[PDB]
Design a protein around this motif. Structure first.
Motif, PDB file in Angstrom:
ATOM      1  N   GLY A  67      -0.330  -8.944  -3.279  1.00 33.59           N
ATOM      2  CA  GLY A  67      -1.610  -8.608  -3.898  1.00 33.59           C
ATOM      3  C   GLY A  67      -1.973  -9.625  -4.964  1.00 33.59           C
ATOM      4  O   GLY A  67      -2.566  -9.278  -5.983  1.00 33.59           O
ATOM      5  N   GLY A  76      -5.371 -10.031  -6.724  1.00 38.23           N
ATOM      6  CA  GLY A  76      -5.833  -8.833  -7.418  1.00 38.23           C
ATOM      7  C   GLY A  76      -6.008  -8.951  -8.917  1.00 38.23           C
ATOM      8  O   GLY A  76      -5.747  -9.996  -9.515  1.00 38.23           O
ATOM      9  N   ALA A 105      -1.330 -12.077   0.126  1.00 42.85           N
ATOM     10  CA  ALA A 105      -2.425 -11.113   0.255  1.00 42.85           C
ATOM     11  C   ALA A 105      -3.249 -11.386   1.517  1.00 42.85           C
ATOM     12  O   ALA A 105      -3.055 -12.401   2.184  1.00 42.85           O
ATOM     13  N   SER A 135      -6.548 -11.889   1.683  1.00 47.27           N
ATOM     14  CA  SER A 135      -7.602 -12.877   1.436  1.00 47.27           C
ATOM     15  C   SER A 135      -7.182 -14.272   1.887  1.00 47.27           C
ATOM     16  O   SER A 135      -6.032 -14.675   1.704  1.00 47.27           O
ATOM     17  N   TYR A 165      -0.588  -6.090   5.224  1.00 42.40           N
ATOM     18  CA  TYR A 165       0.385  -5.250   4.527  1.00 42.40           C
ATOM     19  C   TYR A 165       1.077  -4.240   5.453  1.00 42.40           C
ATOM     20  O   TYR A 165       1.851  -3.400   4.983  1.00 42.40           O
ATOM     21  N   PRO A 222      -2.569  -1.500  -4.315  1.00 43.29           N
ATOM     22  CA  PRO A 222      -2.970  -0.091  -4.453  1.00 43.29           C
ATOM     23  C   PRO A 222      -1.950   0.876  -3.834  1.00 43.29           C
ATOM     24  O   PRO A 222      -1.200   0.480  -2.942  1.00 43.29           O
ATOM     25  N   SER A 269      -2.373   3.250  -1.717  1.00 47.69           N
ATOM     26  CA  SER A 269      -2.637   3.511  -0.297  1.00 47.69           C
ATOM     27  C   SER A 269      -1.748   2.698   0.657  1.00 47.69           C
ATOM     28  O   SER A 269      -1.342   3.204   1.699  1.00 47.69           O
ATOM     29  N   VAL A 270      -1.444   1.451   0.300  1.00 54.31           N
ATOM     30  CA  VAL A 270      -0.641   0.573   1.169  1.00 54.31           C
ATOM     31  C   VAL A 270       0.847   0.519   0.804  1.00 54.31           C
ATOM     32  O   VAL A 270       1.624  -0.137   1.492  1.00 54.31           O
ATOM     33  N   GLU A 289       4.378  -0.474  -9.175  1.00 52.13           N
ATOM     34  CA  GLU A 289       3.444  -0.029 -10.208  1.00 52.13           C
ATOM     35  C   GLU A 289       2.957   1.399  -9.972  1.00 52.13           C
ATOM     36  O   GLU A 289       2.987   1.900  -8.847  1.00 52.13           O
ATOM     37  N   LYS A 290       2.498   2.040 -11.045  1.00 57.63           N
ATOM     38  CA  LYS A 290       1.919   3.384 -10.972  1.00 57.63           C
ATOM     39  C   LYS A 290       0.523   3.279 -10.341  1.00 57.63           C
ATOM     40  O   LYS A 290      -0.032   2.188 -10.293  1.00 57.63           O
ATOM     41  N   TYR A 327     -12.518   5.442  -9.931  1.00 57.86           N
ATOM     42  CA  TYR A 327     -11.081   5.519  -9.675  1.00 57.86           C
ATOM     43  C   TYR A 327     -10.393   6.483 -10.642  1.00 57.86           C
ATOM     44  O   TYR A 327      -9.415   7.147 -10.287  1.00 57.86           O
TER      45      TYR A 327
HETATM   46  N1  NDP Z   1      -5.084  -3.596 -13.368  1.00 58.29           N
HETATM   47  C1  NDP Z   1      -4.196  -3.128 -14.249  1.00 58.29           C
HETATM   48  O1  NDP Z   1      -4.111  -3.603 -15.371  1.00 58.29           O
HETATM   49  C2  NDP Z   1      -3.282  -1.993 -13.880  1.00 58.29           C
HETATM   50  C3  NDP Z   1      -2.791  -1.868 -12.583  1.00 58.29           C
HETATM   51  N2  NDP Z   1      -1.969  -0.866 -12.232  1.00 58.29           N
HETATM   52  C4  NDP Z   1      -1.474  -0.752 -10.850  1.00 58.29           C
HETATM   53  O2  NDP Z   1      -1.139  -2.019 -10.268  1.00 58.29           O
HETATM   54  C5  NDP Z   1      -1.523  -2.054  -8.889  1.00 58.29           C
HETATM   55  C6  NDP Z   1      -2.514  -3.188  -8.651  1.00 58.29           C
HETATM   56  O3  NDP Z   1      -3.675  -2.975  -9.452  1.00 58.29           O
HETATM   57  P1  NDP Z   1      -4.993  -3.884  -9.298  1.00 58.29           P
HETATM   58  O4  NDP Z   1      -4.559  -5.329  -9.332  1.00 58.29           O
HETATM   59  O5  NDP Z   1      -6.028  -3.392 -10.286  1.00 58.29           O
HETATM   60  O6  NDP Z   1      -5.479  -3.472  -7.817  1.00 58.29           O
HETATM   61  P2  NDP Z   1      -6.745  -4.149  -7.083  1.00 58.29           P
HETATM   62  O7  NDP Z   1      -7.768  -3.082  -6.769  1.00 58.29           O
HETATM   63  O8  NDP Z   1      -7.170  -5.396  -7.838  1.00 58.29           O
HETATM   64  O9  NDP Z   1      -6.040  -4.541  -5.694  1.00 58.29           O
HETATM   65  C7  NDP Z   1      -5.009  -5.522  -5.676  1.00 58.29           C
HETATM   66  C8  NDP Z   1      -5.091  -6.360  -4.407  1.00 58.29           C
HETATM   67  O10 NDP Z   1      -4.694  -5.539  -3.305  1.00 58.29           O
HETATM   68  C9  NDP Z   1      -5.573  -5.724  -2.192  1.00 58.29           C
HETATM   69  N3  NDP Z   1      -6.327  -4.485  -1.864  1.00 58.29           N
HETATM   70  C10 NDP Z   1      -7.280  -3.881  -2.613  1.00 58.29           C
HETATM   71  N4  NDP Z   1      -7.753  -2.772  -1.989  1.00 58.29           N
HETATM   72  C11 NDP Z   1      -7.097  -2.660  -0.820  1.00 58.29           C
HETATM   73  C12 NDP Z   1      -7.101  -1.724   0.325  1.00 58.29           C
HETATM   74  N5  NDP Z   1      -7.935  -0.656   0.330  1.00 58.29           N
HETATM   75  N6  NDP Z   1      -6.249  -1.969   1.355  1.00 58.29           N
HETATM   76  C13 NDP Z   1      -5.413  -3.029   1.360  1.00 58.29           C
HETATM   77  N7  NDP Z   1      -5.362  -3.917   0.348  1.00 58.29           N
HETATM   78  C14 NDP Z   1      -6.160  -3.790  -0.742  1.00 58.29           C
HETATM   79  C15 NDP Z   1      -6.539  -6.832  -2.573  1.00 58.29           C
HETATM   80  O11 NDP Z   1      -6.082  -8.064  -2.024  1.00 58.29           O
HETATM   81  P3  NDP Z   1      -6.462  -8.567  -0.542  1.00 58.29           P
HETATM   82  O12 NDP Z   1      -7.731  -7.842  -0.166  1.00 58.29           O
HETATM   83  O13 NDP Z   1      -6.647 -10.051  -0.763  1.00 58.29           O
HETATM   84  O14 NDP Z   1      -5.271  -8.187   0.309  1.00 58.29           O
HETATM   85  C16 NDP Z   1      -6.484  -6.895  -4.081  1.00 58.29           C
HETATM   86  O15 NDP Z   1      -6.700  -8.232  -4.542  1.00 58.29           O
HETATM   87  C17 NDP Z   1      -2.142  -0.703  -8.572  1.00 58.29           C
HETATM   88  O16 NDP Z   1      -1.187   0.135  -7.914  1.00 58.29           O
HETATM   89  C18 NDP Z   1      -2.517  -0.130  -9.924  1.00 58.29           C
HETATM   90  O17 NDP Z   1      -2.515   1.306  -9.918  1.00 58.29           O
HETATM   91  C19 NDP Z   1      -1.582   0.059 -13.117  1.00 58.29           C
HETATM   92  C20 NDP Z   1      -2.008   0.038 -14.437  1.00 58.29           C
HETATM   93  C21 NDP Z   1      -2.900  -0.997 -14.949  1.00 58.29           C
END
Ligand code: NDP
Ligand code: NDP
Ligand code: BG6
Lengths: 484, 484, 484, 484
Positions: free
Chosen positions: D14, D17, D47, D49, D90, D126, D128-129, D155-156, D234
């Motif tokens: 990821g 992300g 990832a 992308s 994934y 996320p 889900s995966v 991660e949570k 969310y």
């Molecule tokens: N952002 C933060 O500071 C925090 C994050 N977390 C946890 O860390 C994890 C990552 O968070 P975050 O980076 O915000 O997540 P994102 O929503 O930014 O998703 C991360 C990456 O996963 C891929 N992705 C997104 N949605 C989907 C989908 N529906 N199916 C498959 N792949 C997907 C995308 O990459 P691609 O499409 O290129 O594969 C994306 O760049 C999460 O579990 C979140 O709960 C927890 C606390 C704080």
């Protein structure tokens, strides 16, 4: 429980022995009479001796050591009907195959719903044959887990130092799981020792006091009038430290010093006992006084060195006072006095928690409070404190708040081995010495023991029936126990 | 010691009274028999009643109330030889001059080395005549300081609230020094009440536990089977709070709560008692349950309102439970339950220090420790705690470490008034109510008492012989005392 | 207050002296400027010296020692207008009559509502004339109680041992009430010393820790860079123990060790200070290290024995470390290190409360916590503790929670004598040495002092500017203070 | 040390992300610059992308979030040289085979002595995966144990209640050992949270105070100025309790309440955290106040319900105050206030240990001491206490002993993720949520959460930028935290 729904076979190996007839079989008799064993239990004696008449041996020898026959209404013949005997060696696999088959025959005859049977092996044998018997049992007399459990009751000595004991444990490792091994320290079956944990952690009064802020000194004492004559010199290679201090009194030590356990489950309790023992500073020659008894003044009891089975220049101690330190925040600065001797003025096992002086406003008109737990004889717990002298005189004196079990309670307390065998059958390991618990105990005393064997620690004479060597009392006094 | 080298005259004013014959003279008899009074002491009765035959009154009436006659070979006639009687009023100066002269005659007849004599005036009189008698004695029956001391033993009631008691003290101020006045609270002469100070401050065990960290609740209990019938309605204007709570139980309260005194001298101890009483939050209607006894179920005992000497709509409480708070760092958050009642199921005076629960690891398989001091009947101190159930069952039960005086000690404990009179003769004021100590006690209860007199606090009925009103028990429970 | 409604006369006896110009008059100036003295106050200097020009002496000499002239907007001339001077002896009654009349003239000129006037006598005089001056003042310069109070501010030394000090107090007894006497110990006017009582008893955090359960060692330290040169050998007969330990550091000791007082009233506080000082075990030769400074390494400072006013074989100590024990339940086993020296590496007055080691689970990766109160220089309070090393490294280090007054607070702290003179005018005796308080202090050190005078205690050399004798540090270490 | 002798591959799944660019890669950059990663480390982004220009993405996007660029002379290009990117799904096993091969290529290119390589998989994905990715990695991208370790940073959220979280853990059970799983709670990487354990157990001062005898109330506070807008709704299904209380603040809670661990090894510490969390009484509706923010007064910030991604009748709380009870002997009766809110007046994370009042002798002239640990902003630890008001006024005021890290220490404290990633590479599990630790946390809040979802708990409005609902403050006050 579920103990009734499946066959139960208790195999006493070394059934022709001293422990078997004096402790094991009598304890089993008491358990039978109290409805603690199934009516259809099978007790199988096993040893090398050939029995010409099994019924006579049972009726004359074994039944001779049963107690409380008259007071309660329990039939002796019914219990003896459950006992069988069998001859065999302690090393040959052919004999352990025979043993297995004899057990199988008893298990098949079980009439209850479930199949198989649970097997308790009591090893009432000398240390020389121990490992060979464990190998034979493991190889050719185990129940499969689906058809019942196997448990091993094993007796001390467990080696004679850290190294020998560790080797012994390593030989057992591949033969049995630690769950299956039940190492006896029979002091853990005594009423007042079993009550230590409840006294400490069920009561706010003692919980709040149980640390170096309130406690000045802790003394653990073992005395016997009996000597070591007629053993065949078995004691000479062991000594008082290996015989009672390393096991019985260290067990008591661990119960008195451990932290509050996370729960009352067996492993939570044993964890705390191991934890505190690993924080005990090893004993050393400078902080001990050793003794070896000589002939009594009245002439009845001969000296230790007059026993024809002991070498003439033996250092073997029959008496020892140790000062130990437990290095943690609960116990820092609190001296622990462990003393144990044979051929003394009385039989005694007691624990004394001596508290600090309340300096003001009574000064020398009060003295240190003391909690006394006496396990034998006449088991009791009492708290020594200062009170006003009864009546018109307005003075002070030391008195007690007393709980003497024979006055307060109308019950006969069981021998240690009744409690323990019962707990082994229930599968509760709380009061059995764990492998790491044993190792921690040996590490405390091994450096001292090796020094004693090399002849580097002085051994003082004392007349049998006396209170021990005079400098033992002086050692106790400077160690911080105020005798009064 | 120096009490023997100078004449001693003990004047019992109101010698024809109830207290005199039942308590005063019997106590003096016991003191004589124990060698606590000089053999040549003079005891002079004084009252308005004319005595036709003094010897008969002494032999028949007075001696009738003496106890332990057979136990020692103490001769009754020898003691009665020391008693004289004399008639006079409680107000006329001519009679106090006569009293002085009679004392002078006795003092001159003293054969020892020193001149003059020490004078102890016991005022066993009603409150109505108190001040007049004090004025007469002060004016015309004082020894000069060079020739001996004068001490006044005085009895309750000391007023009926803060104001009335303060006026009374102000009338005494110019007549006597506080050193000369010995205000009786006879509970301070009881064995187990005298032992409170020693129990608390001579023992590390209780010193360390005696605060809000370990103590959950403190209960002080007074019960009597007797009612208030035949008193002539004397109780109606007083009530249970003024009768026993304001004095007896508050004295006990002060001993249980005071800080460690600077020394064991009388004023150092009394200072601490005053100090803590001034920190007690005054009682209030919301934190109390009042009761007034009705006729017993069996019919033998009539109700409080059936006594022909009490008005028909009386609020006078025969029963009261109070919850008090001591506002300092030792006692913050610790509820103090004071209860006192007449016409109850038993006679009892006990103190219960209920400690906090040890929550882990036993939970509901243990209960609160409790130190119990029972002053009467069958005086004893015991510590309730949890222990393993004796025998093979591995369970818990509540038991005690006990000290029951009649079993442990082979001595007959004296009546309260023996100790107190003896201490007044020695000049020790420790167990006598100081002027400021008295004021502090009245301030605790006066607001409540005035509310009760205005009819603002509900008074609940309870049958004589019962345990009291039901809502008293509920009040105790929610206050924090776990009854078990 | 009521201080304004009646005339106020402050008489500085020995006004021509060192203390007068350097401390007394400057403190009075500050009090005037802060509106703490009445505008129409009269300050009267009294001494044997004849003043040719009083105005010049005031403007040139006295005003030269005034501080904080520029920062705040207070006129110097206005204050000097309140000062008069007068010549007279310290023994002749004729001169104390003249003094009285001069005061009377000032009192009559007071324009306020009430008549008479309050009189504060400051005795800034040598000990040789003390009693004679007290007799003259008592005999012929007292205000009658109806027209105002009289208060005496008196300076050390108060004798040189228990006996000499007791004689001195007995001479004062018939001349003045203890209420009227205000014995200065000027350390009790210092900010951080005044804060000790608040720190200890206003805060649960320190209340709970302030006993032998948590405290391992207490150190009280006095250091000065200055020597004892140019005194005229005045120090030689006194020594460091009499000069600062017996008074300044013992005062601090008493504040650090006393029990919580019954209230914040002056006598409740002073009672506790006396109480604890009477429980201090007297110092002895075995538990001390003495020192006498020699010439500095750089050559600037000459040795103690090079001062032309000291005899050549002087035992006079300029340095001393003492180990004291306070024998009560709060402090048993806690060593108190008192140290004081002149000609050392720095100027310092600090208090260090060193707590016990938390043994687990950090062991040698933590060290003892320490509360540090620094009274001078740069007054501060800080708590030394162990914390994680900031950043990515997961290690430990010792750090502080700090309160440095010059950074936190934007205020200039007054000289000790401003606080004390102000409190003497208010009539608050809290920070003044009571007669029995003084006696208790002398009893601690007198046995040691007499031994030192007989030449029985070794005195070690140390170079001026050094940290003192090496064996002082070793003595401190074995005494139980872990330096780190 | 041995991390350098074998290849190291860090795979960020990821990598395209939000978390990856804002936290993960920047943390890795800092670790590189501090010499905490090997110079020849391989960082592989993964990832779905497609990256048209990897070099540009690295230089423009990733490097944009790096900090402290100017402070050290650490070259950015050198770090970016270690980063590769790779495209893949994934779920498909073909892509995890490709991933494995890419890692193999990097491992073979390692030039050091040992063969194979250690693999750290960071799952910045996320929920889900999650399980699908864990299955793919387990099946086709594991190093064999002989050639290196595999560790998973996850991660949570970890479910949304006890049940959902338990299912998730059961799916992971057969894929990875608990030793290999490193569950992030990033608050455990914050300086002042890491210091809790040292503060409590390395210091006698806090060890002695850390129980219900001295502590009156504990408050844990989380505040943010930011809202929940632009998240895409969310937050609506999660809420403030699941978002920060169940994890971040419960972690802090466990560190503040746990017993002293048996050692500083990871499992000894985690055992204690689990132990205490299982003793926390589950939260309930009666002991909480919930809030949901509305539009700000100034109009800039719109309300929670104005976010187009949230349903119109949402109960989702953005604010919550909870009162919890820890049922054991250390903590009985001590209320724990947990509060957390978004759209408040400030950003804050602090811990407040409020001690009991010292009642005498200062009464209302002192107030409760308080230890304050502020993790952000401007991280600091300080102890609030009462002291004398500086100067001549003899009064009291509240002040602090302060340790503010930015003033005391000249170091820039790292982001949480630097510490944690570093500790994962070292193999230290101390600051990572164990499977049973997670379960214990969910059990505390699940009953409350389910009640909230059923619509049984009232949710109060509060304007964004305000301090929250008014009845939150009243709830805090009656709960026992005295705000001052
Ligand atoms: N952002 C933060 O500071 C925090 C994050 N977390 C946890 O860390 C994890 C990552 O968070 P975050 O980076 O915000 O997540 P994102 O929503 O930014 O998703 C991360 C990456 O996963 C891929 N992705 C997104 N949605 C989907 C989908 N529906 N199916 C498959 N792949 C997907 C995308 O990459 P691609 O499409 O290129 O594969 C994306 O760049 C999460 O579990 C979140 O709960 C927890 C606390 C704080
Ligand atoms: N009885 C007890 O156990 C207790 C007694 N007390 C206190 O002790 C004191 C004495 O109690 P008690 O002995 O019961 O009192 P009584 O009612 O028995 O009176 C005592 C004596 O005082 C004289 N007297 C009685 N009434 C009057 C009056 N109206 N005017 C003048 N003199 C009178 C009588 O002697 P004479 O007519 O011959 O002069 C009588 O013998 C009281 O203050 C009482 O409160 C306190 C607690 C318990
Ligand atoms: O408990 P004791 O010593 O018998 O005393 C009880 C009596 O004490 C008296 O002081 C009370 O006035 C009586 O009402 C009470 O009954």
């Amino acid at each position: 429980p579920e103990l009734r729904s499946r066959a139960l076979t208790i195999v006493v190996l070394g059934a022709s022995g001293d422990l078997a007839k004096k402790k094991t079989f009598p304890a089993l008799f008491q358990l039978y009479c109290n409805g603690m064993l199934p009516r259809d239990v099978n007790i199988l004696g096993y040893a090398r001796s050939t029995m010409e008449d099994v019924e006579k041996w049972k009726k004359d020898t074994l039944a001779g050591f049963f107690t409380r026959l008259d007071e309660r209404g329990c039939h002796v013949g019914n219990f003896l009907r459950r006992i069988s005997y069998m001859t065999g060696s302690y090393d040959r696999d052919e004999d352990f195959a025979r043993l297995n088959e004899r057990i199988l025959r008893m298990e098949e005859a079980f009439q209850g719903p479930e199949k198989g049977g649970n097997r308790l092996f009591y090893l009432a044998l000398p240390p020389s044959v121990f490992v060979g018997v464990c190998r034979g049992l493991s190889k050719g007399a185990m129940q499969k887990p689906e058809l019942g459990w196997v448990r091993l009751i094993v007796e001390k000595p467990f080696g004679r130092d850290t190294e020998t004991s560790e080797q012994l444990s390593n030989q057992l490792k591949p033969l049995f799981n630690e769950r299956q091994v039940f190492r006896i320290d029979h002091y853990l079956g005594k009423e007042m020792v079993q009550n230590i944990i409840v006294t400490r952690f069920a009561n706010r009064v003692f919980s709040a006091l149980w640390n170096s802020n309130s406690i000045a000194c802790v003394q653990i004492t073992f005395k016997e009038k009996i000597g070591t004559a007629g053993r065949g010199g078995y004691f000479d290679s062991i000594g008082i430290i290996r015989d009672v201090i390393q096991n019985h009194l260290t067990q008591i030590l661990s119960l008195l010093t451990m932290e509050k356990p996370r729960s009352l489950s067996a492993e939570d309790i044993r964890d705390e006992k191991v934890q505190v023992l690993r924080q005990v500073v090893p004993a050393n020659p400078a902080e001990c006084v050793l003794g070896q008894y000589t002939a009594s003044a009245d002439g009845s009891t001969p000296g230790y060195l007059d026993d024809p089975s002991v070498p003439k220049g033996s250092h073997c101690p029959t008496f020892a006072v140790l000062r130990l330190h437990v290095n943690n925040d609960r116990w820092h600065g609190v001296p622990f006095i462990i003393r144990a001797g044979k051929a003394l003025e009385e039989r005694l096992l007691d624990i004394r928690i001596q508290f600090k002086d309340e300096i003001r406003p009574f000064g020398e008109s009060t003295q240190r409070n003391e909690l006394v737990i006496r396990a034998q004889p006449s088991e009791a717990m009492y708290l020594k404190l200062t009170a006003k002298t009864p009546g018109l005189l307005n003075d002070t004196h030391q008195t007690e708040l007393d709980l003497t079990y024979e006055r307060r309670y109308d019950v006969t307390l069981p021998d240690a081995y009744e409690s323990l065998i019962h707990e082994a059958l229930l599968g509760n390991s709380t009061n059995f010495v764990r492998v790491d618990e044993l190792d921690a105990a040996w590490r405390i005393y091994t450096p001292l023991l090796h020094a004693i064997d090399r002849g580097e620690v002085k051994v003082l004479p004392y007349a049998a029936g006396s209170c021990g060597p005079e400098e033992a009392q002086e050692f106790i006094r400077i160690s911080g126990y105020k005798t009064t």
